[PDB]
Structure formats: structure tokens, C-alpha cells
Amino acid sequence: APTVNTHFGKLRGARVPLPSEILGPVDQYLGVPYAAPPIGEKRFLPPEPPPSWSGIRNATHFPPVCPQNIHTAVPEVMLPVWFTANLDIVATYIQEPNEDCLYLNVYVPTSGAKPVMVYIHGGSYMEGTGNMIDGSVLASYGNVIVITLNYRVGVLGFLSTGDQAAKGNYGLLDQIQALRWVSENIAFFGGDPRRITVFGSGIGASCVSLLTLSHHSEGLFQRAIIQSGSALSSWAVNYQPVKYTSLLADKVGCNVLDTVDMVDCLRQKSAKELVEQDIQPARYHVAFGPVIDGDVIPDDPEILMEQGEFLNYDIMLGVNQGEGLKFVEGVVDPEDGVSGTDFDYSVSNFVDNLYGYPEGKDTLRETIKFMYTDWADRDNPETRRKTLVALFTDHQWVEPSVVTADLHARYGSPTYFYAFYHHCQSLMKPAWSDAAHGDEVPYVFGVPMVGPTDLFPCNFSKNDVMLSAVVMTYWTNFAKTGDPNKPVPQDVAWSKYNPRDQLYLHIGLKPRVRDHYRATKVAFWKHLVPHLYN
Amino acid sequence: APTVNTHFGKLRGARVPLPSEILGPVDQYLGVPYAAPPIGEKRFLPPEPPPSWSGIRNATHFPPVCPQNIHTAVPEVMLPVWFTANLDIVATYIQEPNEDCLYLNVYVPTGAKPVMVYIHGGSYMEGTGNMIDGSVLASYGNVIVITLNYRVGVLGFLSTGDQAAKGNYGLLDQIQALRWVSENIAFFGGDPRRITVFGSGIGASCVSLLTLSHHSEGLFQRAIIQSGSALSSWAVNYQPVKYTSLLADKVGCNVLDTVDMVDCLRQKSAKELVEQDIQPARYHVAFGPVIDGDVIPDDPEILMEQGEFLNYDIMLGVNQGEGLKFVEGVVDPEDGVSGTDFDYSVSNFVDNLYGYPEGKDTLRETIKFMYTDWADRDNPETRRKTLVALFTDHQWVEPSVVTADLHARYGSPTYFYAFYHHCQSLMKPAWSDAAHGDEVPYVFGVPMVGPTDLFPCNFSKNDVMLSAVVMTYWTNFAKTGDPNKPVPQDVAWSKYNPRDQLYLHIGLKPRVRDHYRATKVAFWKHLVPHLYN
Ligand SMILES: *[C@@H]1O[C@H](CO)[C@@H](O)[C@H](O)[C@H]1NC(C)=O
Ligand SMILES: *[C@@H]1O[C@H](CO)[C@@H](O)[C@H](O)[C@H]1NC(C)=O
Ligand SMILES: *[C@@H]1O[C@H](CO)[C@@H](O)[C@H](O)[C@H]1NC(C)=O
Numbered sequence A: 001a002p003t004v005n006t007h008f009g010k011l012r013g014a015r016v017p018l019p020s021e022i023l024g025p026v027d028q029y030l031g032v033p034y035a036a037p038p039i040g041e042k043r044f045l046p047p048e049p050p051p052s053w054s055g056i057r058n059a060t061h062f063p064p065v066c067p068q069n070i071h072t073a074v075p076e077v078m079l080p081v082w083f084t085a086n087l088d089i090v091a092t093y094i095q096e097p098n099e100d101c102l103y104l105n106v107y108v109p110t111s112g113a114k115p116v117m118v119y120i121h122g123g124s125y126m127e128g129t130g131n132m133i134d135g136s137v138l139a140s141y142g143n144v145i146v147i148t149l150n151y152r153v154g155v156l157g158f159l160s161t162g163d164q165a166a167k168g169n170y171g172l173l174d175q176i177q178a179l180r181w182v183s184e185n186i187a188f189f190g191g192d193p194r195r196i197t198v199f200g201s202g203i204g205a206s207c208v209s210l211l212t213l214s215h216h217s218e219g220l221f222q223r224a225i226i227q228s229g230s231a232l233s234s235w236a237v238n239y240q241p242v243k244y245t246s247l248l249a250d251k252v253g254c255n256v257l258d259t260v261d262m263v264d265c266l267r268q269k270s271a272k273e274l275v276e277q278d279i280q281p282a283r284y285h286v287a288f289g290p291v292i293d294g295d296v297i298p299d300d301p302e303i304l305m306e307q308g309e310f311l312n313y314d315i316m317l318g319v320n321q322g323e324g325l326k327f328v329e330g331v332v333d334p335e336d337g338v339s340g341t342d343f344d345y346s347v348s349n350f351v352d353n354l355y356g357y358p359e360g361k362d363t364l365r366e367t368i369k370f371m372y373t374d375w376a377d378r379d380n381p382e383t384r385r386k387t388l389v390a391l392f393t394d395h396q397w398v399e400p401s402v403v404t405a406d407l408h409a410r411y412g413s414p415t416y417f418y419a420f421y422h423h424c425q426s427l428m429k430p431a432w433s434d435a436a437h438g439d440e441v442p443y444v445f446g447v448p449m450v451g452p453t454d455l456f457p458c459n460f461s462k463n464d465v466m467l468s469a470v471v472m473t474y475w476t477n478f479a480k481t482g483d484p485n486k487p488v489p490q491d492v493a494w495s496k497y498n499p500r501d502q503l504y505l506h507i508g509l510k511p512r513v514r515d516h517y518r519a520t521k522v523a524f525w526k527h528l529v530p531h532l533y534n
Numbered sequence B: 001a002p003t004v005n006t007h008f009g010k011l012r013g014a015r016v017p018l019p020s021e022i023l024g025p026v027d028q029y030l031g032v033p034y035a036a037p038p039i040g041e042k043r044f045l046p047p048e049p050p051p052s053w054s055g056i057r058n059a060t061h062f063p064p065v066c067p068q069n070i071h072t073a074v075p076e077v078m079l080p081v082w083f084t085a086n087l088d089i090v091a092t093y094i095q096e097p098n099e100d101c102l103y104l105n106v107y108v109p110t111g112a113k114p115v116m117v118y119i120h121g122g123s124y125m126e127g128t129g130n131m132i133d134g135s136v137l138a139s140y141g142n143v144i145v146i147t148l149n150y151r152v153g154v155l156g157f158l159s160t161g162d163q164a165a166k167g168n169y170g171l172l173d174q175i176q177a178l179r180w181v182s183e184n185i186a187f188f189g190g191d192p193r194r195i196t197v198f199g200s201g202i203g204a205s206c207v208s209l210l211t212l213s214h215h216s217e218g219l220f221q222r223a224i225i226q227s228g229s230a231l232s233s234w235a236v237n238y239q240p241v242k243y244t245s246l247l248a249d250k251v252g253c254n255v256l257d258t259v260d261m262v263d264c265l266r267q268k269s270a271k272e273l274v275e276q277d278i279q280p281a282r283y284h285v286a287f288g289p290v291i292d293g294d295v296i297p298d299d300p301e302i303l304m305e306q307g308e309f310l311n312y313d314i315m316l317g318v319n320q321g322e323g324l325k326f327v328e329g330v331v332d333p334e335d336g337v338s339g340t341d342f343d344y345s346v347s348n349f350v351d352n353l354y355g356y357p358e359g360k361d362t363l364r365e366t367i368k369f370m371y372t373d374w375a376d377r378d379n380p381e382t383r384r385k386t387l388v389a390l391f392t393d394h395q396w397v398e399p400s401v402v403t404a405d406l407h408a409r410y411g412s413p414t415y416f417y418a419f420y421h422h423c424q425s426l427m428k429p430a431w432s433d434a435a436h437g438d439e440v441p442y443v444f445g446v447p448m449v450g451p452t453d454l455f456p457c458n459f460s461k462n463d464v465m466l467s468a469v470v471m472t473y474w475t476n477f478a479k480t481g482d483p484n485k486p487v488p489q490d491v492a493w494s495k496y497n498p499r500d501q502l503y504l505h506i507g508l509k510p511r512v513r514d515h516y517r518a519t520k521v522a523f524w525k526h527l528v529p530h531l532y533n
């Protein structure tokens, strides 16, 4: 009977033994309320502290997830491969969602106060839950506390009228609120409030990125790990909340004169209704997500990076070899190639969606075509496919991540960069593909140590286990000391990243330090492309 | 007393033994007239057959070279490094030039032998085949080597853009010299059926043009085009009318009627026409080959598409650092180039070649980007290398590749190379790679004789070994049209085609590679035309 005392009352967790003998068991406390339920008047309002309970509270079972619908259309590209490939298994987690969903899960190892790693999940700002990820392995192996949380998503989480009626960013405020709770209470679990690291993958990483740039998050956590995401990608921030919110208002018939009144009208509607609505944004953009409210996000995220807000965090970030898999998947023939006409089509469509037919568009389009053509093997259809993925991977992930890594390490503050060049073999993904979006997740959470799971049907080798131990060792070490190499040595040194040297860690079965990761491509998007048009 | 009978008379050459003991002696016949003197009425007229001579002609000494002046300004970048670095020694060859200068030199080893006809070239204004001694190439490769003299500068390429002066007289001289060889080299033990013509620099620009001419038909079978093309900005003069009239004004021979001004120009001393300081636009030529519609029927690129030169076996290539003189002015004592200096030269380059058209600003930044090493942005030494490469790629590599592509289009025999070696000397900065003309000494086997007045290089044993290799490749091509047959190296030089793009990397360790600087070549060929109108 594992019990822990907190500022709001006592709660009872469970001791669960890992299938692996070598790994020790963990005490896990599921469904701990970190805020008062955001329902009724509380909807579209910042989170409030949870009420206290007089007795011992049961933390044995998973709570309801936040209102969401996987069947309803959402941007496919934004979601991790493991997610879309296994929608059936995911559905078992999402069933019976409730607006009362602000809960978190805690995984504690069985010397001294332990570091705390707070994970932020994320599919597309519309879906997902921390429940899918079981932090037991990461906790027991690295001897740290692992936390997975649930936050308001979609309409309920990010609705904004662009004024005082609905400022937005409620999903982010929940994360802040969840972080305060950990800061004030994790000491009760044997956790160190002074050593708190927050990390996420994909959209989760975009959230982590934004948390580092916020005044509200100041003092709560010390380090961040930003995996395959940034505050700078086209779908990280919604620059038209007013447009998409009114579209919602019309669909539910909540159209009225005063924005204050229409928000109130939205409060009356069932939580289910607001979610189901088919509100599609412009391609590679988001209809409901973080906005620049002037409070939580005081300015354009890039400007905030220049101002130096997030320099007081130790930061580790990186990308995968083939993130943008879904960008070309539609157009790949059975021979695993892409035709020249198809290449020209995708490149042009890419320029259409991202740059929107500006002056000199014809000039840029040809320039993009040139940079991502392998002139040493012009005709090869397979290589044509690789470059096409690379085009999307570089633009949406690599360049924004690198710009972030540069701006953070500008004054020597601790920064680490990586490129993930390995992935499990599975039927979830075409055999010709490299490490795709989210493919780093299983190794971070030590899935090969437990073997194949319902969510990761991968056929893990001994090599997979070996790398997973390595990745976790790097990851937990960073949490403990802000240095990937200390204190637990590998049984290669991960060098610090600075704008001049540009050293990064190539993570694969063959690990090594390298420099200037795709710098020529990164330079193209950062420097040359802004010049070509206007 | 080495004597040979010809269609124009008997002539006696001299037999000279090579300093290398391994190499056998050669019979050399110097100053053989291949055309009637182009003087008086003959000036600015196509070459005519040489008159016969009744006695035995002495061919032991060099004849006068064509009218030229090395002191008078000519574009420095166009000239080979060995030439400009040793103007003093060059001057001894150029002394006493005479308008009666259409002579050639023959080098014969002691069955019928292949004939290699070399065409020299600095800038169309100067030079002579006399400077190059084909004895080594002849004795080692067992082939006949021929170096010729042709009309240069005003006398060689003056054009009024009409019938008064069609131009291309320098090329016509080369054609005429080739006819002479075709009809008479059999008397020397040569095979008229196996004739290869080759040249370096502007000389290579000529060979390229000869292959595209109707006039050259039937004369020669193979060509070796070294560090030159018919497509470079300075290969063809597209404003002959403009520069010719400038000359007329300076000599005071300017008139409305073209026939009369040409006639007046005939009156002037050969001396007067040469000395004149007439500078063309940068990287362009004031006097050179023109598109007359006869010798050069159309734009050289168009002629390539039409397929004129497909019936020739062709071998061509470039050097690693051709464009040395493009950046030499701007190199600091640290052997580096500053960013401001980098931006300056790149901007000036776009100014000269593209002439400030619309979207020049967009193009300028794109050039800057492509030739910046973003993996070592700050390095001043690397900035220097890229600056050399920019000029090297644009002026030599890309035009050469385009030529090689168009020739091998239907599978006709083509071979490509990149020369990645050079001798150590004071002629050239120590940091430099193989520069313009640096392949010449190895082609002509200079290391076999050791350092000469024209090539003060300190040749190592490695230099000798490579020179043997290069000559073996070269002479093999002359004999069979294949670099590998019949004499084996004791590496196989693969044929070049547009898809595979295989080339021979020539250095102390020769090897086959593919798609030589293809990304850079593709930039100049495909992307750059798009940016500006
Ligand atoms: C918690 O669950 C246990 C059974 O697992 C039950 O005995 C206990 O009464 C529950 N506590 C509360 C407060 O409901
Ligand atoms: C899973 O492993 C088995 C061997 O145990 C193999 O037959 C199968 O191909 C593997 N699956 C994938 C997707 O590689
Ligand atoms: C032939 O010419 C050479 C020039 O090198 C001269 O020295 C020689 O005396 C001449 N011989 C005769 C027989 O005229």
C-alpha cells in the first residue's frame, strides 16, 4: 500500500514490478488532480488549484482524457507515425473522454532526492494523452521521477477570440499549473524540485519550446529537452485564432453581437459538440493552438528567443533523419520511387501552401527544385523520394530547431543538439523509410527493455535495447546534472553545441560527434530563401 | 643529313639527341612554310598554298613569329601562368617578328606513325608554337608532333562584319596548315589517316572551333581539348565591327566604306597595327574568331547540337585551379580573402559577365550562397579557394562539360579529365592548385629533360612518373582513339557519357570518378539562366 502525503491530501498509489528482472519495481500514482476541473464557468478560464480531500485518495486507475476525437479529421502530417499507424490501439486509451481531465501520472523508482522529468505529450494540439506512455522503464533505469500529464486540447484548450473574452493558451496554462504542482509537491515523492526537466516530442516539444519563452513558467523548471519540434514551425502558433473561432461559432450556431456573449454561449454547448466540428485550417497550419496573447506568449516566439528569456534553461534538442515521411507517402509508387512530374508537383504545391503565391514565386520554386535535386544521380526515382522527404524535414524541423539551438547557445549557455538516425523495424512504416516523426520516443522511454507493446509492435533486436539504454542514459544524465555525460558513463562524449563549432550528436547504433548538421541546407532556408522573394 | 621530299620541294632538317638516355633521338624540321606569305594584297585574305623551291631547303632554325607585342597590354587572366611568370624568356622567342610567319615545325621519331598537331594560344594576340619542343612527346610516344605558327591579333582576326574583311584568318591558317600535313606528312613517315589536333587554353578554344567547321572536314580525325572551349566568354568575339572601327580611328584609317578602310589598313605597317592599345570588355576579346557564316556558320553551341563534331574522337578536360588570376589581386599575406573582398569580387564578376540586367541583385546573392562553405563560413583561406572555383567553374568547367555532354550525346567516343597535379616553383603561389597551363609540361614530357628556361620547375621523380603516364594516355588516344590502347600503364580511363559522367582524375594517383563538380556545373547550366531575363 504505497502512500504519499501532499499539500491537498494523502493519496494511495500502486507498486508495480517491471517484467525485466534487472530493473527494479516502481511506485506509480495515476490520476492526481493538479487543478480544479475546468467545467461550467471554469471553461475557457485559466486553471485553478484543486480542492483538498480529507481522507486517503485513490490513485490506482487512469482518469478520463480531455475531450477529443481521433476519428474527426486532424492534420495527418503533424501526428507521429506510431500514432496514426495504430489508431485502433490508441482508441482504447481515448474512450470515454471527460472535460474533467486535468490530471497527471507519477512514476517513482524504489540515493538522495531524485530528479524529475515532466513529459508533455502532443499530436496536433487537438488530441493525445500522457496515459499512452508508461514512464516506468525510464524511471527505474535512470533513477529519476517521470511524470506524464493531461492538458486541455483543441477548442477547449486553445479557443481564442483575439481579445479579453477568450485570451486562449489554456492548454499551456494547464502545463504551467501542472509544473507548479510538481515544484511545490514532488518533494513529497522524494523528488527534487530544484532539478526539474520538462521534455516533449513533436507538438509536445513545440509546447516545451513555448514554455521556455514565457514569463509564467519562470522559476518552475531548470532544463528542457525539445524533441522534433519548435516554437518556429508553421504549425506551432496560430496567427489567425479570430478567423477559426468565428467559424466554430457559426457551426454551433453561437453567433452573437458581443464576443463576451458568444464565449458564454459556447459554455452552454456540450463539450462533445465543440470537439467534433470539422474545422480545417490552411495546409501545414493549425486552426486551434497557442496564440500570441501578449501575456503567456508576449510576442512572436522568435523575438522572444532573441530577448534571451529561455537562456536560463539547460536545453537539449534534436531531430530525426526522415521526419517528413508523410509529405511524400502519397506519391511513392510500388518501386519506391517518385517521378519527375510528381517531384515538380509536390515542390510547387509546397511553395503554394507555405509561401502563398507572392512576387517572384516562380523564381523561388525553381531554386527549391535545384537545391533538392541530386545532380550526381538526376534520374534516380528512389533518391528523388529521399530529397523530397528531406525538403520537408529540413524546412519544418531541422532549420527551425537549428535556429533555436543557435539562439539559445548564443552566449554560451548550455545547449546540446542531436540527429536521430535509427528506428525500429516494423509494419507501421514503409521499409525504405528512415527515422520518422516520433520514432525516437520508444528508445527514450525504454520500450525495447520490455519488448513489443500494443502501441509499439516493433520487432526489437539486441541492438535496439543497447541503444535505448544509451539514449536513456544520456537523457536522465541531462536531467540530473545538465550534462548528458555526467554522472553515469556509457558502458563517445556528447559535446556542447555552439553557433561557431556547431557540434551535434549523431544518435544511431553507430554513435559519434559531428558538426554543422545539414548546414548548407539550413543556410538555404535561413538566409537565401528570405532574399529570393520581396 | 636528314632529308625529306615534299610536294613543294626537298628540305633538310637536323637530327637531335635527347638528354634522356632512355629516349631515342628525333629528326626535327623547323620553319616549313605551309602557306604563301600573307602580306601586301595577301593580308586580310585566306591563306594560299606556298610556292615551290628549287633547291634543298635548310630547316634547322626557327623562322620569325607572327606580328605581336608582349609588352603591349592584353588580358592577363587569359594567359597561362608559365607564360606571364617568365615574360623575359618568352621575349627571346618573340624577338624579330615578321608578317611572313606561316611556318610549322615537325618532330619525327627515329609502320606509319600517328600525327599530333599542336595549336598554341595565349589570347589570340600573341604566342608561337616555337616555344614548345615536341621532341620528348615524339620520342617517348613514338608519334609525329607538329607545332605551328598562325596569324594572331589584328592580322589574324580583324573583321568588318561584312565582305571587306570576313575574319577568322588565324583559324583559316590552322586549316591550311592541317591540309599541308594531310597531303605531305606521309613523306615524313606519318599516317594522314591518324591525325590528332590538340591545344591548351585559347589554343583549345581554336581546336573546339575547328571541329565545328565545314572547312576542317576530312583533315583530322581526333581532337584533344585542354583547358578551353568554344563556349567561354572570350572564345568568340560578338562585336567585331565595334573594335575594328576603334582600330581604324587610332591608325587614322577610318572611312564610311568598309572596302576602303580595309584597303587603307593594308597600307599600314604590320608594326603599327599591333602596338595599338585596344582593350575589350572584361573577360571578353577585341580581336578573335567571329561568326562569319562561313568558317563559323553559327553560334558555337548551336553547331554542337547540329552534330558537326560527332565524327571526331574527342578528349577534353580542365585543371583544379584554372582561375588563379581571378583572385590573385585580393589575396592578403595570410593567404586569405576578406568577406568584404569576397562580396566585392563576386559583385564585380556579375557586373562584367551579365551586365546589370533585371534581377541581378537576386542572382548576385545566389552566386554568393552557392560558393560559400557554410561548414566553415569564417575561414579566409577557404574563401579564397571558393573564389578561385567560382571563376574556374564558370569559365572552364561548365563550358567544357557542356561540350563533353553534347559530343557524347549519341555515344561517339569522348573522354573527360580533371588535372589535379602541378610542379613546384616560384612561378605560382605555394597555396595554389594546378593553374592555367600547368598541364602543358607533363603533356610534353618536360620532367624527362629536367628544368628548362620556360619551365623552371623542380621536377621530382613523381613528376617524371606522371608525365610518362599522361603522355602514354595522350599518344595512345592519337594511335587508336582510345587512351588505354595499345600501350598499357606499367588504371583504365573510362568513356564519358551524359548519364554516367565518368572522368579521369589526373594526379599522382590516377582514378576514375563521376559527375565532376556536377552540382556546381548544374548551377551555371540550369538554375542561373532562370533568375535573370
Ligand atoms: C479506494 O479503493 C479501495 C479498493 O481498491 C477501496 O477499498 C477504498 O474504499 C477506496 N477509497 C475511496 C476513498 O473511495
Ligand atoms: C518480426 O520478426 C520476425 C522474426 O522473429 C520477422 O519474421 C518479421 O519480418 C519481423 N517484422 C518486421 C516488420 O521486420
Ligand atoms: C643550315 O642552317 C643552320 C642553322 O642552324 C646553319 O648553322 C648551317 O650552317 C646551315 N647549313 C648549310 C649547309 O647551309
Ligand SMILES: *[C@@H]1O[C@H](CO)[C@@H](O)[C@H](O)[C@H]1NC(C)=O
Residues within 6 Å of the ligand: B424, B425, B426, B456, B457, B458
Ligand atoms: C626546388 O626543389 C626543392 C626540392 O628538391 C623544392 O623544395 C623547392 O621548392 C624547389 N624550388 C623551386 C624554386 O622550384
